Amino acid sequence: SGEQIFRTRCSSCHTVGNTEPGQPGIGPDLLGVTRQRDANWLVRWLKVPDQMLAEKDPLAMLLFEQYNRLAMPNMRLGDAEVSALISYLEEETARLQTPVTNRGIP
């Protein structure tokens, strides 16, 4: 269900596997981030991003200047609408990880 949420309030700056190599577009690749970044921070950042950057909470201040020097605004989503989108990033990562010694596209 989180895939429909991605397509309607998220795909404007993102993908789940499909940035350009070492070139993060308007916003970096979400596939596998659920198993790299802190699992509380990932969901909380999505609920208050431009105001976490205004708190000067330094985890964000470090990461944003190293992708594309652009800020993410708050989309103003609801908690259960976020929970479904967390389950899209988690379950699409669980299927589209493609560790078959062939993830590339010819």
Enumerate binding residues for ligand HEC (CB under 6 A).
Answer: 9-10, 12-14, 26-28, 30, 33, 37, 42, 46, 49, 63-64, 67-68, 70, 72-73, 75, 85
Reduce the secondary structure of 44-59 to three states and give it as a string.
HHCCCHHHHHHCCCHH
Minimum distance of ligand HEC from residue 13's CB (angstroms)? 3
Smallest gap, in angstroms, from Cβ of residue 69 to ligand HEC? Answer: 9
Nearer to ligand HEC, 95 or 101 (CB): 95
User: Which stretch of DSSP H or E encloses residue 3?
Assistant: helix 2-9
CB of 89 to ligand HEC, least distance (A): 7
40-to-34, 62, 72, 73, 86 alpha-carbon distances in Å: 10, 18, 18, 19, 11
Nearest one of 76, 75, 45 to 58, comparing CA atoms: 45
Cβ closer to ligand HEC: 68 or 98? 68
